[PDB]
C-alpha cells in the first residue's frame, strides 16, 4: 500500500476506530483537490486509499477528524481536526505510513517512509 | 497575552528560535483571514500576538513553518508545515498556550488553557 | 503475541532497527528479575518475548537501549535509555504492544492493550 | 536553578499540579541515592531542586508519580510511574528543563538544555 494511516488513542490505550480521514492533493491552481477518504477499521488502520499509479508526485494533505471521535466518547476536545501536509514521491515512489496518537488536548504524528 | 506559542526542538534539546508563525481566523465566509504573525525569539516563544479585545470566540489556525527551520539546519524534513486548528470559547477568562515539539519526521502539539 | 515492542525513529522516518530491549519482572523481594530480551528487527518490531503461560500477573519493566542506537548514528543523545513500567494481566490476560517514538532529546511511548 | 521539571496534562489541557517528583543520583556503587524531591505547583513546575554547587556531572534519574495523579482524577492509568534517566555533563554552563506530557496510556518527555 503506498499510503496507510494508523490512529491510536492515548486515553484508552486502544486503536482509534471509525475515525474519518480525508486526503487532498494540491492542484495546479493551488487549491486542495479531493483525493481519497475512508474510516479507520478495528486495528485503527486505513488501507486502500490509492494505488501506486495514481499516487504521483505532489503535495498531499491528510486530515483526521479528531473532533468527531472525541465527541462520540463524551469529551469536548481542543482541536478541530489534525492535519498532516507533506510532499510525496518527489524522488521516486515511496510507501508512506502516517501515524497519529490522539489525546483530547494533544496529538502527535509521525511518518514512516520506506523504499519498495 | 491571551495567545502564546512555544516551539521546542527535539533533535537539539533547545528552544526553536527564528521560527515563522502565522495565525488565522475563520471568516463568516469560510476562508482564513490573517490575524497575526511573528518569529519565535530565543526562548522559543512568540508573545504579543493579540489582545483580549480582539481575541473573540471563533475558530483559529496556527501555522508553524517547520520546513524552513529544518532546512536552515541541514536536515531534510517531512512536513511542509505544522498546523493547529482550534476553537476559542468564552467560558471563563482563558489564556491559550499552543506548544509544539519538533522533529524532522514527527511533531507533537498540546494546548495549555489556564484562567487568570 | 502477549508482549510486542515497536520502536520508531522520528529523525529518519523509519523503524528503529537493531535496538536492544530488556524486560524485567518485579520479584517478591522487590528486585527486578530478568525476564526476556531481544533486538528489534527490520520493521522495528520485537516479537517472541514470552508466552501466555509464562506472562503472569505482575509488574514489568521494558528497558529500551536508546543511547546505543543514537551513538551508532553519530549522535550523542540525552537519555541513557527509555524505561516503561507497568502492571500486566491483573484483570486477566491481555495482549500488550509497547510503542516508542525516539528523538535524540525526546521520546514518546504509548501502550495498546487488547483483550483476546 | 540548574534543574527544573515541568509536567503537563494532555487530557485536560492544564499544568499537572500536585504531582510528586523524586530525583536520584547514581552512586559510585551502582545504586540510586535520593537527591531531591517535591510536588509540582500550580503552573506544573518544580523549582529549587538543587544548586550549581551540588549538581555535579553524573547520571540522574527523575521519577514522576503519574499513577497517583490519574487515580486522583478517576482515570485508570497504564504506567506505574514515568522515569527519565540522563547524564549531566560539564561542557559549558547548562540549565536543564525536564518536561513531561501525560496521558493515561502514553507519555512524552523532552529536555530543554540551555546555557546562561
Ligand atoms: O505501522 C504501525 O503498525 C504502527 C504501529 C505502532 C505505532 N505506534 C506509533 C506511535 C507511537 C507513538 Cl508514542 C506516537 C505516534 Cl505518533 C505513533 O506509530 C505506529 C505505527
Ligand atoms: O520549559 C518550559 O517552560 C516549557 C513550557 C512548555 C512546554 N511544553 C512542552 C511540551 C510540549 C509537548 Cl507537545 C510535549 C512535551 Cl514532552 C513538552 O515542554 C514545555 C516546556
Residue numbers in the entry:
A (entry chain A), B (entry chain B), C (entry chain A), D (entry chain B): 10 to 125
Sentences from the study reporting this entry:
Human transthyretin (TTR) is a 55 kDa homotetrameric protein that transports thyroxine (T4) and retinol-binding protein (RBP) in the serum and cerebrospinal fluid. Wild-type (WT) TTR is intrinsically amyloidogenic, and causes amyloid fibril formation in elderly individuals, resulting in senile systemic amyloidosis (SSA). Tetramer dissociation is thought to be the rate-limiting step in amyloid formation. In this paper, native MS, neutron crystallography, and computer simulations have been used to investigate the effects of the T119M and S52P mutations on TTR stability and the molecular determinants of amyloid formation.
In the S52P/tafamidis complex, the CD loop is not stabilised by tafamidis binding and the distance between Ser52-N and Ser50-Cα remains as 4.6 Å. In contrast to the findings of Bulawa et al., no water molecules were found bridging the protein and tafamidis in this complex. Instead, tafamidis induced a 180° flip to the Thr119 side chain, with the hydroxyl moiety now forming a hydrogen bond to a water molecule that bridges the two TTR dimers via Asp18; this was observed in both binding sites. Interestingly, this water molecule fills the same space that is occupied by the Met119 side chain in the non-pathogenic T119M mutant. The appearance of a bridging water molecule in the S52P/tafamidis complex results in a conformation that resembles that of Met119 in T119M-TTR in this region of the protein,  and may provide insight to the  mechanism by which the drug stabilises the TTR tetramer. In this case, tetramer dissociation was almost eliminated by the presence of the drug. This also demonstrated that one molecule of tafamidis per tetramer was sufficient for effective stabilisation. The binding affinity of tafamidis to TTR quantifies the stabilising effect of the drug on TTR tetramers, and was measured to be ~12 kcal mol−1 (Kd1 = 2 nM). Tafamidis therefore stabilises native TTR thermodynamically and kinetically in a manner that is comparable to T119M.
